[PDB]
């Protein structure tokens, strides 16, 4: 994860560059820091980057639910017994499980 990308076309003193990387990161965090405004001098720019691979494309709920349901189907245990439900769901499912399986 990245918060800010700043670009310059000159070789600006690697050591103090890393020091400023630490300083900005600590200062601009609202949990530990009280700064909000940044001023760029000397020609340093800010690249408007985006996020390439997010965690919202990985929607794995339906597949995992399907695998669990298919395993329960294979053994024969009704899903209501594992999850739990209302009385009309509780007792007939218990009878069906015991008898049929």
């Amino acid at each position: 994860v990245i918060g800010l990308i700043l670009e310059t076309d000159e070789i600006l003193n690697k050591k103090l560059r890393e020091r400023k990387q630490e300083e900005l990161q600590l200062d601009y965090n609202p949990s530990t820091g009280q700064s909000s405004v940044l001023i760029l001098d000397g020609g340093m720019k800010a690249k408007p980057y985006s996020q390439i691979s997010s965690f919202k494309d990985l929607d794995f709920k339906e597949d995992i639910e399907g695998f669990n349901k298919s395993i329960c189907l294979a053994f024969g245990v009704p899903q209501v017994l594992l999850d739990g439900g209302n009385n009309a769901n509780i007792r007939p499912n218990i009878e069906l499980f015991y008898y049929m399986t």
Binding site: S70, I71, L73, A74, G76, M100
Partner: protein, 91 residues
């Protein structure tokens, strides 16, 4: 007798197997859960049912001289001297 049984015989002298892919059948049964469960359900439900021998119809049959008690024992209790009733029904 039927005057046209010879034509029906000539149309199909012998039976044809309709289970085209036995090996694929076995592999699918052995490695996929929605087939194993359904097939086992059908076979077990069919094997659970019993049978009752009742009245005797006054017709000439292929096998004659068999009493009601013997049929009751064969269909319900133990068909073969060497095999289970449940195994026989499931097979």
């Amino acid at each position: 007798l039927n005057p046209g049984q010879r034509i029906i015989r000539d149309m199909e002298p012998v039976s044809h197997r309709t289970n085209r892919k036995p090996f694929t059948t076995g592999q699918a049964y052995s490695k996929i859960e929605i087939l194993n469960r359904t097939a086992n359900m059908v076979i077990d439900s069919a094997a659970e049912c019993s049978y009752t021998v009742g009245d005797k119809y006054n017709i000439v049959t292929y096998a004659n001289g068999v009493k009601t008690k013997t049929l009751d024992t064969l269909l319900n209790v133990r068909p073969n001297p060497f095999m289970d009733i449940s195994t026989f029904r499931r097979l």
